[PDB]
């Protein structure tokens, strides 16, 4: 049950295209932050995003629910499922890497999410600029009156 076994057989299972098996077989690897990004790099080449997001949704139930898991989850929800980014990020904003997600969100740059995020992390100055340059989608009369102070 060592990490090496599950991670070695995950690639052969994905090549065999048994995502049911590989899903449960990879839960013991995602828990290791030093073994997560490699798996996502393997999978993006496969393009099986719809198939691995279920594994990531299952990773929340895993006891070792660490931060990099949520960073990658939000990274993929940002552009592959952008409607879900804000909603999923209502919770793990106090659980997820700030700058990597910020620069990663720059691609979709759904400015509302970035503004709300900066407002949560007290980095209000960036939110002011973001509301200044892209206000059509990301602007609110209410909060911009007091955040400015």
């Amino acid at each position: 049950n060592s990490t090496r076994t599950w991670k070695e057989v995950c690639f052969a299972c994905v090549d065999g295209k048994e995502f049911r098996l590989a899903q449960m077989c990879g839960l013991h690897i995602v828990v290791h932050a030093d073994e997560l990004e490699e798996l996502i790099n393997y999978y993006q080449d496969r393009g099986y995003f719809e198939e691995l997001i279920t594994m990531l949704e299952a990773a929340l139930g895993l006891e070792r629910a660490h931060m990099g898991m949520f960073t990658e989850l939000a990274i993929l929800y940002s552009k592959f499922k952008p409607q879900k980014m804000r909603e999923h990020l209502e919770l793990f904003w106090s659980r997820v890497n700030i700058p990597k997600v910020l620069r990663a969100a720059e691609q979709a740059h759904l400015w509302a999410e970035l503004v709300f995020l900066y407002d949560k992390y007290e980095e209000y100055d960036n939110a002011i600029i973001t509301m200044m340059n892209h206000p059509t989608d990301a602007w609110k009369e209410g909060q911009f009156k007091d955040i400015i102070t």
Partner: peptide
């Protein structure tokens, strides 16, 4: 299926 092919154009379409 080299999803980067669809992904580049999809992202550009979305942003444009």
């Amino acid at each position: 299926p080299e999803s980067i092919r669809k992904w580049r154009e999809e992202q550009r379409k979305r942003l444009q």
